[PDB]
Design a protein around this ligand. Structure first.
Ligand SMILES: *[C@@H]1O[C@H](CO)[C@@H](O[C@@H]2O[C@H](CO)[C@@H](O)[C@H](O)[C@H]2NC(C)=O)[C@H](O)[C@H]1NC(C)=O
Lengths: 247, 596
């Protein structure tokens, strides 16, 4: 993954995201979020999801929290308190740690100001911690805004590399485009049933039909939105609906 | 910008850039002390030289900060140790002279060898051999000759070297804003911060004898008991008005009186609690012993261990040529790595030592939440006292019966409990006069009250007067007795154990009082006592983040020194001593001497 001060942000659209694997996999050490109930991810449908993946230190996962102070939360990646999404943090010691001392992933430590919600700043400038300009030189009261991680093979929980990806579900004026599928049951015939064919609802009894839909229509009707023929969204066949008997 | 923010930024940079370096140094030291190899030699060399070389610049930055206005008491607390001059204000000549003097003292102390006049081609060293032969001998002549040989082929040359070291270190203190080296040593038990919790540097000087004088009845009764045993022993050597000699102290210096157990047996027939044979009959492996100790620690309430300690560290029987020195230690490597170093064996002494080292581990993890600069206790007395609390708590018969070791039908009576109390006191309270007089001698020599000529005469005079140990043969000025010691020739503080005994007994009594236990304190078990564990957790977790007097506020409600727990523990023993030697009178005469 990316560094915490340069977290990899990707915009995701028009993908049928099955969050069931996310909901069930134990590979994710952290699945702790509040924006959406974890069981309703498939049903709720959004647009232009933002996946921000990075590698941090183990103890920094609590830094990722709305209205929370810290080091990487206020200097590397700030979360607005109106988060609608989730955070996935999992231990990856064998993935991003080295026996000789891993120092690849750096983290911002000193910043002149705070960070805006969902703001990414890649500024690499000398820090003026005193009353004299540092001129890009580490003099008196002059330090480095970034520091390095200390991943070691014998490091326990809290120091090992943690891979964290945050998913932000934004619902703006554009039509929603990212969400999972709906389970399709087995088809029955010749029985008074009720159905939800591809979003078109109705109660009746279905039979095999011989009508020839022209290759782009979906369903047919006779008079005043009284649907008579439908096409199954799976096998591409034409059935017809008649009402359940009464009198 | 304000100076406090600059100091905080300096701390944020320095702790981060020093954590990795000290972690590497600890890794190298542990690797050598576990995987002994020639490569590990230069491993520690090149991982420990960098520590000092980097701390050089770390202290170099800590001079531009005016450490007289930083507030909140937190930045100042760390920066005071960071802004420590120590031995960095010298010229090359004096510094190299001090280094050479320490080197020659160490070499002479570590080269100790004694050969008899008849055969000078086979000497024996301070390692077992001479030591075991003389400390557990049967005749007087070999003990006297061994004492003379050690005092005449080790400490004879060290008089001028010790004098030069003492004066040079006093000059070090004077150039480093201290009147004495003893003042620097006493600066540990002192805080200059919060009002009402302050302790002065000169307070300890009076307080040591203030808390030492109350054991004078117990010490004198034990001394009279030992004297009566000696008179009943080999005669024409002990007088009813004198005291016990110097070479019959059970040791070289009389520092520890554990080996005098057999000669001063009150009952003798009744044995102590020792079911090591029951353990080996149960065929317990060392992991079972460690698991039982962990179960006791969890029953107390101390936090659980993290995984990795039981894996990366060696546990038992290293075996083949890849040897491992196993001095009992609880290695605080840090950065999610904490280990132990021990030759764990199935024996009660090893069981108590494992409890001691696991208690040291628990204390070290207690202040682990502190930053790098403050991952240690407020004073040197808390560490070993915490270590020995769970050593004292694992000796009660009830715990041994509860771990399925003692017999279910093993009942406790007066005789065995009294014997256990007496044997515990033989080592615990049998060293305080010697420690007090040694610290007094060091304070006097660093202050300079006594002149160069009146060093050893005064030492032996206050040994006869306070401790009660006499001159076997006369030595005036050509034998340097204190330099023939580990803590005097290695520059290690000895008040650490003096405060450690008081701390451990105070904490033992505190947990026993707040553990819902009634009866003798020697049978008090802190196992399955959640309130005692809560108290110990709430206290030990602070570390050095709080002053020692402020630290002396949670386990015991008293911030002052009280010797009362020491007498509280050994109350039945003193009560029996009040009637055993009801004929011989306690005390001794200084004018009496073996030769005079
Ligand atoms: C939807 O996926 C199913 C699963 O493969 C497809 O069903 C297969 O279709 C082929 C082609 O007729 C058959 O040979 C297989 O026997 C079918 N497998 C089954 C029913 O398990 C189906 O064709 C796909 N339909 C669409 C529109 O994509």
């Amino acid at each position: 993954f990316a560094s915490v001060y340069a977290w990899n942000r990707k915009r995701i659209s028009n993908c049928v995201a099955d969050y069931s694997v996310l909901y069930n996999s134990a590979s994710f050490s952290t699945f702790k979020c509040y924006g959406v109930s974890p069981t309703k991810l498939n049903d709720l449908c959004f647009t232009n999801v933002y996946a921000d993946s990075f590698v941090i230190r183990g103890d920094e996962v609590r830094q990722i929290a709305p209205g929370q102070t810290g080091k990487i939360a206020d200097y590397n990646y700030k979360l607005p308190d109106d988060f609608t999404g989730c955070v996935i943090a999992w231990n990856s010691n064998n993935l991003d740690s080295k026996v000789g001392g891993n120092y690849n992933y750096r983290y911002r430590l000193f910043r002149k100001s705070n960070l805006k919600p969902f703001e990414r700043d890649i500024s690499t400038e000398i820090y003026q911690a005193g009353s004299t300009p540092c001129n890009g030189v580490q003099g008196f009261n002059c330090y480095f805004p970034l520091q390095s991680y200390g991943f070691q093979p014998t490091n326990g929980v809290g120091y090992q590399p943690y891979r964290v990806v945050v998913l932000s579900f934004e619902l703006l004026h554009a039509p929603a485009t990212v969400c999972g599928p709906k389970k399709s049951t087995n088809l029955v015939k010749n029985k008074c049933v009720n159905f939800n064919f591809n979003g078109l609802t109705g109660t009746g009894v279905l039979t095999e039909s011989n009508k020839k839909f022209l290759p782009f229509q979906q369903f047919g009707r006779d008079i005043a939105d009284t649907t008579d023929a439908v096409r199954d969204p799976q096998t591409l066949e034409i059935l017809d609906i008649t009402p359940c008997s009464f009198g | 910008s304000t100076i406090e923010e600059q100091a905080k930024t300096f701390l944020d940079k320095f702790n981060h850039e020093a954590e990795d370096l000290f972690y590497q140094s600890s890794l190298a030291s542990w690797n050598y002390n576990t995987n002994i190899t020639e490569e590990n030699v230069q491993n520690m060399n090149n991982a420990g030289d960098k520590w000092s070389a980097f701390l050089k610049e770390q202290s170099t930055l800590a001079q531009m900060y005016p450490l007289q206005e930083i507030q909140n008491l937190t930045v100042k607390l760390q920066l005071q140790a960071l802004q420590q001059n120590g031995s960095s204000v010298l010229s090359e000549d004096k510094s190299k002279r001090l280094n050479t003097i320490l080197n020659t003292m160490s070499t002479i102390y570590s080269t100790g060898k004694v050969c008899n006049p008849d055969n000078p081609q086979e000497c024996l060293l301070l390692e077992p051999g001479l030591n075991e032969i003389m400390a557990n001998s049967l005749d007087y002549n070999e003990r006297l000759w061994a004492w003379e040989s050690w005092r005449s082929e080790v400490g004879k040359q060290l008089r001028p070297l010790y004098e030069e070291y003492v004066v040079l270190k006093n000059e070090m203190a004077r150039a480093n804003h201290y009147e004495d080296y003893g003042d620097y040593w006493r600066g540990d038990y002192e805080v200059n911060g919060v009002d009402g919790y302050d302790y002065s540097r000169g307070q300890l000087i009076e307080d040591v004898e203030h808390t030492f004088e109350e054991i004078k009845p117990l010490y004198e009764h034990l001394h009279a008991y030992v004297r009566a045993k000696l008179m009943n022993a080999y005669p024409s050597y002990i007088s009813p008005i004198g005291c016990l000699p110097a070479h019959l102290l059970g040791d070289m210096w009389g520092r520890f009186w554990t080996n005098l157990y057999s000669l001063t047996v009150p009952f003798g027939q009744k044995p102590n609690i020792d079911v090591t044979d029951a353990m080996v009959d149960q065929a317990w492996d060392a992991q079972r012993i460690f698991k039982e100790a962990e179960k006791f620690f969890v029953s107390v309430g101390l936090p659980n261990m993290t995984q990795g300690f039981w894996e990366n560290s060696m546990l038992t029987d290293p075996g083949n040529v890849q040897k491992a020195v196993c001095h009992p230690t609880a290695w605080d490597l840090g950065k999610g790595d904490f280990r132990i170093l021990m030759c764990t064996k199935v024996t009660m002494d090893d069981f108590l030592t494992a409890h001691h080292e696991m208690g040291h581990i628990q204390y070290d993890m207690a202040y682990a939440a502190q930053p790098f600069l403050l991952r240690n206790g407020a004073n040197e007395g808390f560490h070993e006292a915490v270590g020995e609390i769970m050593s004292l708590s694992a000796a009660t018969p009830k715990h041994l019966k509860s771990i399925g070791l003692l017999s279910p039908d093993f009942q406790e009576d007066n005789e065995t409990e009294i014997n256990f109390l007496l044997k515990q006191a033989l080592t615990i309270v049998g060293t305080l006069p010697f420690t007090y007089m040694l610290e007094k001698w060091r304070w006097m020599v660093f202050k300079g009250e006594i002149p160069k000529d009146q060093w050893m005469k005064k030492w032996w005079e206050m040994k006869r007067e306070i401790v009660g140990v006499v001159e076997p043969v006369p030595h005036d000025e050509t034998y340097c007795d204190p330099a023939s010691l580990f803590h005097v020739s290695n520059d290690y503080s000895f008040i650490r154990y003096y405060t450690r005994t008081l701390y451990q007994f105070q904490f033992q009594e505190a947990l026993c009082q707040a553990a819902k236990h009634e009866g003798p304190l020697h049978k008090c078990d802190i196992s399955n006592s959640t309130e005692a564990g809560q108290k110990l957790f709430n206290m030990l977790r602070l570390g050095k983040s709080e002053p020692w007097t402020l630290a002396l506020e949670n386990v015991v409600g008293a911030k002052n020194m009280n010797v009362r727990p020491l007498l509280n523990y050994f109350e039945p023993l003193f009560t029996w001593l009040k009637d055993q030697n009801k004929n011989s009178f306690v005390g001794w005469s200084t004018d009496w001497s073996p030769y005079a």
